[PDB]
Design a protein around this ligand. Structure first.
Ligand SMILES: *[C@](O)(CCCCCCc1ccccc1)c1ncc(-c2ccccn2)o1
Ligand SMILES: *[C@](O)(CCCCCCc1ccccc1)c1ncc(-c2ccccn2)o1
Ligand SMILES: [Cl-]
Lengths: 545, 546
């Protein structure tokens, strides 16, 4: 029976179509009244300058809103990144608090950021036609800071994916190349911000879901420490999994934009609306520091062989940092295989997938999820026998499979404790070399559509820091050259298993696509992390001031 | 076989004896050289004044250290609160950083605060002769702030108890009345600080273990939000249970001492030594505020009927707050039975007790734990059958028994999510009435020895805030009167089960014993919480000296 799933799809498509139609009408009505508005001047302004002109009165909020609405609508045509037009938002426009740190700034939202009167489907049939009954906390704070949230953007079915397709709204494409994934689970945001259609957005990230789409689409993203920001009111599909913690964070065209966004969120409105978040205000002094940095670095995690473009990105950044006076120290977190295979996978799937799979009862399984659902459905004894068979030839596959089995509360306790010990073990490493920050590769360039679901190993660069729960952001530093792309033909991977084979093929045909590096700091050091991101932005892409 | 347990007891008792003997020799040697030191003047100084005089140079650190060491040794004689003399600590004395916020202050440590070269036994055989390899983080911070940690103090076997006895170092007694429990699991500290033998100490608290001993021994304690202070290096016996988190916090003779101790701990040293703790510095402006407060309150949680002393303590505090200009708003957190029976008990024993019971293999089970170990050992089906049998008669006993069973990772996720939602439910309730703070009763007067283990129900007043993970502190406000004590003979309890019956008997003969109220704020509001504790202290113990 798929009648219910087909009904949901038909309806979701109707709403998305209607929303885009409403956007078109609003944009045309505005343009007829403002024939002389220099829209490209306004669209190309960096957020900081846009904000200052909104604040001075030089730009009206309406001019900014409708110009950006027009561009969002245009870029959606080739990306399918927008799922819904947040229908209140013009009335919010007219009432945006004037002294707010984000006054007059349109902000895009990953679909799971609950918004009153709108579904947060996550691409699942069961969530369709169940509108949210209030704004989640961070949407409330944005609004109290004068921001104007205006679209929900697309995500892969269930959000447990670094691709971006679902059976409801379909497939989001990379704005730089249609055959490529925008990444995700925050892929809508990546596609939208990456093509100029929103100056600022929020995403979420449990295995790389802010960082993948940022990297793949050539923009900036920060995954803070999990509890730096509020997850109150967020839509999700598994509840009470605390071993590997969700984080929510900003995505934007530059580092300053992420900094401003954090500064606006980390205010009294957030702290009182959600007392469970520690009231740590944005430390501007740490963000603005120009002190030389002790920067740890690795060019590979020995788990996912990096692409030629990834490796060159890393070495060139290393080199410009050295040239600017920073100390670059080789550093690799210990026991990565164990963090990924036992701690991260086990933490994410301690119950064998059963809670997660309830979401798919009755539903279609998007092709971009691959065989994940098929695998999770297998009984525990079969996952185990399969694991023992695969171990000698494909130890990685064997490891994930074994750790995706159900267990007792007793074993989850043991797992939670190991996560905590691992965390302190890397902190210890870090302190022993006296690092300030850590520079790593970031998976790049964008994989072809429907391949992230088949290259699970490639999450190693990002998931490590979900497991450690350290702040981690990504900055675009280069684009893939023909030379980089030709060298993929020599890429073999460290394991030679199906994940390596698919990644080889998936990263081909990527000339001109953006490639990032990743910046990490210790827990609660989001300001230092951003300070480091700002430095990399400056040295590698000087033109983004 | 208890041959190993007996061996560990014999050794631990030798060490304790040797420790105390070393303390005596050091005290005697000092006193010989300082015949004209007014030790009572020095002992009776409040910590803030003591700190200032250490800081000016008017009192030497040696004077303060040895005078306090002498008092500790004296009060131990009738309390058995000291398990070990922290042997480095005279060398640390000589090297204590002069600009440190706690320069020259002797500090007592609950035995689970790891200290280089010493066991943290927790009263368990299996931890004896396994000396800690370094100081835990908060001990390091204390030392970097110029403090001088000097004794490990006693705890009930495993710490999972609000009495204070174990098979290794034995039973700690209340300094006010030796037939009474000092409370605990931080009972050593309560007994030591409560009789004058230490001006400041740190304890831990997962179900009330800072607040019970503070309340029972007539002193102050704060249980902060769990992750306000670093737990790195703390000794425990259950690993990876994150549903109901442990919290560490100060104990002292007044509120200002708690404030100073939090201020000294919340510095860059702690934050960089344990990056997992959010670097929230102590907000003095919030602590020193004298704004009128919206104070929620209840005289009873409808779970544990309060003793007459508890209820009067609560109403008199309510009344003085109103007299002082604060708004007192009736308020009771919703669904307390659920939070205690399902959320707290389940989170604490999600695995049916199996990890916890590992600690007791081969060991004696201290009488003061009651039947806890016997009940955890019971197979799951039998816990369940027993529970259905008890349900009609004793629903409370039935509930705990049912929620003490093992479950899957899947159900723990559901539970962890329920804890998180309940937390938000109470927060919403709290915001709906626009409270600043909450005033509740606090269990007591001190129960007789070996009865906390049989009055599990009486953790209701404190464990609620472990479950909610709100900062909660206790302040002494009155002592039990003849009239309060006479009225316990009419105490029936709300359930009439064996826990109500034992509490009635256990609080008997308590004239003169201290009785506290409890102060709560929202998560991360330790400064507001302490501000409110200060106000109750000012109104109810006006003769509490500066
Ligand atoms: C996003 O980070 C997910 C990226 C894809 C990670 C797949 C990891 C994996 C590991 C082992 C086996 C298979 C796959 C992301 N952002 C939000 C969420 C999310 C998911 C579910 C509930 C709430 N939030 O994932
Ligand atoms: C302390 O808070 C314990 C107070 C007693 C709580 C008993 C609650 C209970 C009993 C039976 C059934 C259900 C609930 C305290 N402080 C520290 C610790 C501790 C214990 C074990 C390991 C580490 N820390 O308990
Ligand atoms: Cl936290």
């Amino acid at each position: 029976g798929r009648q219910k799933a087909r009904g949901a799809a038909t309806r979701a498509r109707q709403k998305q179509r209607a929303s885009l139609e409403t956007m078109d009408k609003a944009v045309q009505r505005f343009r007829l009244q403002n024939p002389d508005l220099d829209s490209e001047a306004l669209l190309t302004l960096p957020l900081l300058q846009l904000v200052q002109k909104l604040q001075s009165g030089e730009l009206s909020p309406e001019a900014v809103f409708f110009t950006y609405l027009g561009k969002a609508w245009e870029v959606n045509k080739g990306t399918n990144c927008v799922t819904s037009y947040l229908t209140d938002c013009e009335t919010q426009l007219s009432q945006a608090p004037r002294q707010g740190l984000l006054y007059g700034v349109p902000v895009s939202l990953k679909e799971c950021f609950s918004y009153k009167g709108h579904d947060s489907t996550l691409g699942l049939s069961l969530n369709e036609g169940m509108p949210s009954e209030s704004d989640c906390v961070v949407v409330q704070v944005l609004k109290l800071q004068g921001a104007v949230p205006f679209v929900h953007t697309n995500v892969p079915q269930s959000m447990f994916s670094y691709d971006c397709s679902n059976p409801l709204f379909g497939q989001t494409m990379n704005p730089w190349k249609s055959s490529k994934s925008p990444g995700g689970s925050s892929g809508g945001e990546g596609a939208l911000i990456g093509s100029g259609g929103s100056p600022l957005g929020l995403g979420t990230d449990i295995g790389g879901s802010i960082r993948f789409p940022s990297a793949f689409c050539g923009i900036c993203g920060l995954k803070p420490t999990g509890n730096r920001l509020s997850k109150s009111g967020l839509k999700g599909c598994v509840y009470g999994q605390t071993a590997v913690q969700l984080s929510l964070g900003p995505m934007a065209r530059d580092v300053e934009s992420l900094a401003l966004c954090l500064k606006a969120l980390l205010c009294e409105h957030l702290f009182t609306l959600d007392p469970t978040v520690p009231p740590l205000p944005f430390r501007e002094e740490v963000y603005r520091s120009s002190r030389p940095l002790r920067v740890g670095y690795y060019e590979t995690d020995n788990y996912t062989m990096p692409s030629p473009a990834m490796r060159r990105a890393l070495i060139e950044t290393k080199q410009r940092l050295e040239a600017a006076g920073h100390t670059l120290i080789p550093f690799l977190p210990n026991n990565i295989p164990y963090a990924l295979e036992v701690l991260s996978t086990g933490g994410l799937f301690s119950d064998g997938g059963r809670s997660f799979l309830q979401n798919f009862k009755g539903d279609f399984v998007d092709p971009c999820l691959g065989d994940l659902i098929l695998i999770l459905r297998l009984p525990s004894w079969f996952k185990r026998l399969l694991s023992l068979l695969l171990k000698p030839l494909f130890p990685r596959l064997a490891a994930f499979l074994n750790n995706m089995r159900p267990r007792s509360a007793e074993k989850l306790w043991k797992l939670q404790h190991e996560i905590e010990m691992y965390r302190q073990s890397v902190i210890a490493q870090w302190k022993a070399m006296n690092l300030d920050v850590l520079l790593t590769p970031m998976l790049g360039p964008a994989l072809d559509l429907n391949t992230p679901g088949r290259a699970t190993g490639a999450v190693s660069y990002t998931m490590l820091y979900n497991c450690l729960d350290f702040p981690a952001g990504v900055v675009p530093v280069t684009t893939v050259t023909a030379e980089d792309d030709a060298q993929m033909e020599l890429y073999k991977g460290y394991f030679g298993d199906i994940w390596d084979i698919i990644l080889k093929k998936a990263m081909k045909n990527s000339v001109g696509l953006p490639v990032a590096v990743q910046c990490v700091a210790l827990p609660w050091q989001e300001e230092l992390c951003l300070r480091f991101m700002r430095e990399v932005e400056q040295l590698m892409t000087p033109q983004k001031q």
